[PDB]
Design a protein around this ligand. Structure first.
Ligand SMILES: *[C@@H]1O[C@H](CO[C@@H]2O[C@@H](C)[C@@H](O)[C@@H](O)[C@@H]2O)[C@@H](O[C@@H]2O[C@H](CO)[C@@H](O)[C@H](O)[C@H]2NC(C)=O)[C@H](O)[C@H]1NC(C)=O
Ligand SMILES: *[C@@H]1O[C@H](CO[C@@H]2O[C@@H](C)[C@@H](O)[C@@H](O)[C@@H]2O)[C@@H](O[C@@H]2O[C@H](CO)[C@@H](O)[C@H](O)[C@H]2NC(C)=O)[C@H](O)[C@H]1NC(C)=O
Ligand SMILES: *[C@@H]1O[C@H](CO[C@@H]2O[C@@H](C)[C@@H](O)[C@@H](O)[C@@H]2O)[C@@H](O[C@@H]2O[C@H](CO)[C@@H](O)[C@H](O)[C@H]2NC(C)=O)[C@H](O)[C@H]1NC(C)=O
Ligand SMILES: *[C@@H]1O[C@H](CO)[C@@H](O[C@@H]2O[C@H](CO)[C@@H](O)[C@H](O)[C@H]2NC(C)=O)[C@H](O)[C@H]1NC(C)=O
Ligand SMILES: *[C@@H]1O[C@H](CO)[C@@H](O[C@@H]2O[C@H](CO)[C@@H](O)[C@H](O)[C@H]2NC(C)=O)[C@H](O)[C@H]1NC(C)=O
Ligand SMILES: *[C@@H]1O[C@H](CO)[C@@H](O[C@@H]2O[C@H](CO)[C@@H](O)[C@H](O)[C@H]2NC(C)=O)[C@H](O)[C@H]1NC(C)=O
Lengths: 491, 123, 109
């Protein structure tokens, strides 16, 4: 938390941003067209601000540092002109200190890192002071010359567009035109209303986005060559108004890339004791459940409100896994509201629970002729448990009038006991492992989904089709059109 | 079945320490407190102290507070008791007794072991 | 501590009473009195535990009760195999317990 403030505070520095800032609204290929759109753009011939944080001051001195947080109204346009890698990344959040999950974007000379976590930023970002449980991560390639970025956040989605154009004429924004191609479409779902830059004389221009109605000119290959802004002059307003200057099926879906790590919980060796059950959170994966039921190694695969051979086409937001080891004839106690003490002193289920239950046999794995003695379960407590509560406190349970002051004696007892496992027993005392799956979803983009299919494209027989959701009917054939290498379909 | 086996005899000298072991076969070891008892030759029985095999908490009698220790090795099913710095008049016999409760101190001592004979003299 | 009569006699067939006199907060405080039978050399064996409750193996001929600050045993029926002495135990207090002196049982057989 170094203190390097300088306190100069010279606000007024403004420059004209003109014919600058037009991106590709959506992923389509159109050729020789004049399209019209109503969306968030930067007004032509506007005032952008010229921050000059680090500066060589007058003789005998070079010190100023005034890069503050700025309002994030609807989106932002950020332009930089640096001869080196001096600026590095950004921080986004509401209050930036353990109240809303903040977002960090940084990068090396060779790698880039995006992370959403509940930070506690210090003053004048060695950048933060602590980190905790958090949600998302990502790695890819890192992002004179001029570099321009456009940041938008809508509907639980963060979108970043970028462009690199080399100039050497002057420090001001050049006259001319260049569109900005799409780069990143992260799902996060947090809310943002302030931001702050970080760098390691520095100058950058910042401007704000507003809703307008643009007219765009697509040329022969599909690159926005020119644009005109309505509502600027009567002339351009007239420019706007005049608009001038079956046999079978086919299903085809992408590869199956990101398998989901169920090979850990169902294969590990040191699961738990009954009162210290773990909790594993799984997200951002493609999970196939068909491999599980057919495994034939399970002897209890009950379910609640899922209908197993129906779920494979559903997407949730969070999936949790719990795991532990209990004695034999208590697998009939992990269910909706019940009581056999292991449902109301160690583990408790909600009434409207939607999940699945697993139970192996483990006779030949945890056996010990002497006795395993390593698994503990609770026996004494004054009050029952609300759903999903852990208690690892070994306090001495009073059972009499006199306070014993933490002395295990005549009326103060120990609240734990050990399972005596051994191989000469039978079913009903042998150890059964248990894994419980729970599903949840709320107001957030889905991440966990089932695996989709593909059906051996046929082109010369005029049939149905479903290309990644663009259903239709017709005859298919190969073309010579070259898209841009991000566009999907062309209308 | 439920059995306790105690170690062999022992002869020591004044100013020395002695340690005896009691081994449990049958039941599940954790879950029953264990008491020790001493019988003098010709006198009456007396109480020694109790220990627990699950936590480790232990307690003695009022007069035997200084020179007595006692532990439990919950891996090979055994419990040890050591009395140090024996006067020659402490010739007696020591018994290990198991309680019959379940994680409670109750006091019905059954079953008992066999009994060690300890002899301390200046010879 | 506490004590009881150190002598007792008996004859086959009939019944005798053997006592154990309690103190203020030795026997009359809490209900944990138990009595044992001690052959000459072997280990003891439970004859009665916690008030008058009895394990399986000991016949019903044994009994007991607690008259405030006094415990007792009565054997209505004698098979001459019971000649050794007997001991009475109770929760003395503060996780420390006390036994009794013992009472030799004499038969005329
Ligand atoms: C989708 O998969 C096909 C083929 O399936 C597998 O893809 C590999 C990643 C690997 O898992 C192999 O088992 C299979 O090949 C991919 O088609 C391949 O494309 C490359 C590109 O030139 C070609 O050399 C291979 O021969 C193709 N595979 C076959 C079997 O001919 C395809 O690329 C995958 N999708 C994407 C977007 O890459
Ligand atoms: C959990 O493990 C079983 C056991 O299979 C082996 O596990 C490891 C010890 C290692 O040796 C693996 O290579 C073995 O496969 C898994 O069961 C296997 O599943 C695969 C997948 O279909 C199948 O081809 C094997 O025949 C199975 N082997 C046995 C013995 O059942 C199981 O799949 C693992 N859990 C998960 C979630 O995959
Ligand atoms: C052995 O146990 C005694 C506890 O005696 C009683 O136990 C309970 C019923 C409770 O009511 C206690 O308060 C009773 O005293 C332990 O003696 C106590 O120890 C701690 C710390 O010294 C404290 O509670 C009291 O001061 C003690 N009470 C006394 C001395 O009367 C004693 O410590 C235990 N032995 C060991 C080695 O821990
Ligand atoms: C906004 O851009 C215009 C340049 O087009 C400038 O606005 C001038 O603002 C000052 C004081 O705010 C006025 O005295 C001038 O008359 C304005 N001129 C014009 C042409 O608008 C200025 O450079 C930018 N900043 C502000 C605050 O207006
Ligand atoms: C680059 O940034 C990453 C993450 O911010 C730093 O951590 C490295 O991450 C890469 C990712 O593949 C790993 O391969 C490296 O092993 C990580 N480094 C260490 C030390 O664990 C990384 O240090 C940064 N610098 C470089 C040169 O990669
Ligand atoms: C549209 O794309 C086509 C193909 O990518 C371009 O045609 C090539 O253009 C380059 C540079 O002008 C020439 O060297 C090639 O010989 C052209 N190829 C053919 C087959 O003619 C075309 O120039 C692009 N349109 C514009 C306006 O740049």
């Amino acid at each position: 938390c170094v203190n390097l403030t300088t306190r100069t505070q010279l606000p007024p520095a403004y420059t004209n941003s003109f014919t600058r800032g037009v991106y590709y609204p959506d992923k389509v290929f159109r050729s020789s067209v004049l399209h019209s759109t109503q969306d968030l753009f930067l007004p032509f011939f506007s005032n952008v601000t010229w921050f000059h944080a680090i500066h060589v001051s007058g003789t005998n001195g070079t010190k100023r540092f005034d890069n503050p947080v700025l309002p994030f109204n609807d989106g932002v346009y950020f332009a930089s002109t640096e001869k080196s890698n001096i600026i590095r990344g950004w921080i986004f959040g509401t209050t930036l200190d353990s109240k809303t999950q903040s977002l960090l974007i940084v990068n090396n000379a060779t790698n880039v890192v995006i992370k959403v976590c509940e930070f506690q930023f210090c003053n004048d970002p060695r950048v933060y002071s602590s980190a905790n449980n958090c949600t998302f991560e990502y790695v890819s390639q890192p992002f004179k010359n001029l570099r321009e970025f456009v940041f938008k956040n809508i509907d639980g989605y963060f979108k970043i567009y970028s462009k690199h154009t080399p100039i050497n004429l002057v420090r001001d924004l050049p006259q001319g035109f260049s569109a900005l191609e799409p780069l990143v479409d992260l799902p996060i779902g947090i809310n943002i209303t302030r931001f702050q830059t970080l760098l390691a004389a520095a100058a950058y221009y910042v401007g704000y986005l507003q809703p307008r109605t643009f007219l765009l000119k697509y040329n022969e290959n599909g690159t926005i060559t020119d644009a005109v802004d309505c509502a600027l002059d009567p002339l351009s307003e007239t420019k706007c108004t005049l608009k001038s200057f079956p046999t079978e099926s086919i299903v085809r879906f992408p590869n199956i890339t990101n398998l989901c790590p169920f090979g850990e919980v169902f294969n590990a060796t040191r699961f738990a004791s009954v009162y210290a059950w773990n909790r594993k959170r799984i997200s951002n994966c493609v999970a196939d459940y068909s491999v599980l039921y057919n495994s034939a190694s399970f002897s209890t695969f009950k379910c609640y409100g899922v209908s197993p051979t129906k779920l494979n086409d559903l997407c949730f937001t969070n999936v949790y896994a719990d795991s532990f080891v209990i004695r034999g004839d208590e697998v009939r106690q992990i269910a909706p509201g019940q009581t056999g003490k292991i449902a109301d002193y160690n583990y408790k289920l909600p009434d409207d629970f939607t999940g699945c239950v697993i139970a192996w046999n483990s006779n030949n794995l945890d056996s010990k002729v002497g006795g395993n003695y390593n698994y503990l379960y609770r026996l004494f407590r004054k009050s029952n448990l609300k759903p999903f509560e852990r208690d690892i406190s070994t306090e001495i349970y009073q059972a009499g009038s006199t306070p014993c002051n933490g002395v295990e004696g005549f009326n103060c007892y120990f609240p734990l006991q050990s399972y005596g496992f051994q191989p000469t027993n039978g079913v009903g005392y042998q150890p059964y492992r248990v894994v419980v799956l729970s599903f949840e979803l709320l107001h957030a983009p889905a991440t966990v989904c089932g695996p989709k299919k593909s059906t051996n494209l046929v082109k010369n027989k005029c049939v149905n089709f479903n290309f990644n959701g663009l259903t239709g009917t017709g005859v298919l054939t190969e073309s010579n059109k070259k898209f841009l290498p991000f566009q999907q379909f062309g209308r | 079945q439920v059995q306790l086996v105690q170690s062999g005899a022992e002869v020591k000298k004044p100013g020395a320490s002695v340690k005896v072991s009691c081994r449990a076969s049958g039941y599940t070891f954790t879950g029953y407190y264990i008491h020790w008892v001493r019988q003098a030759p010709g006198q009456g029985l007396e109480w020694m102290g109790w220990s627990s095999p699950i936590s480790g908490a232990t307690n003695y009698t009022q007069k035997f507070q200084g020179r007595v220790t006692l532990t439990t090795d919950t891996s090979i099913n055994t419990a040890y008791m050591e009395l140090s710095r024996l006067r020659p008049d402490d010739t007696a016999v020591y018994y290990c007794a198991r309680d019959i409760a379940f994680a409670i101190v109750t006091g019905s001592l059954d079953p008992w072991g066999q009994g060690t004979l300890v002899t301390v003299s200046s010879a | 501590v506490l004590t009881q009569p150190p002598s007792a006699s008996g004859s086959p067939g009939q019944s005798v009473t053997i006592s154990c006199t309690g103190t203020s907060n030795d026997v009359g405080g809490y209900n944990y009195v138990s009595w044992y039978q001690h052959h000459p050399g072997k280990a003891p064996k439970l004859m009665i535990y916690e008030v008058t409750k009895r394990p399986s193996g000991v016949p019903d001929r044994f009994s007991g009760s607690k008259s405030g600050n006094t415990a007792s045993l009565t054997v209505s029926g004698l098979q001459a195999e019971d000649e050794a002495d007997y001991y009475c135990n109770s929760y003395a207090g503060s996780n420390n317990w006390v036994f009794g002196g013992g009472t030799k049982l004499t038969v005329l057989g």
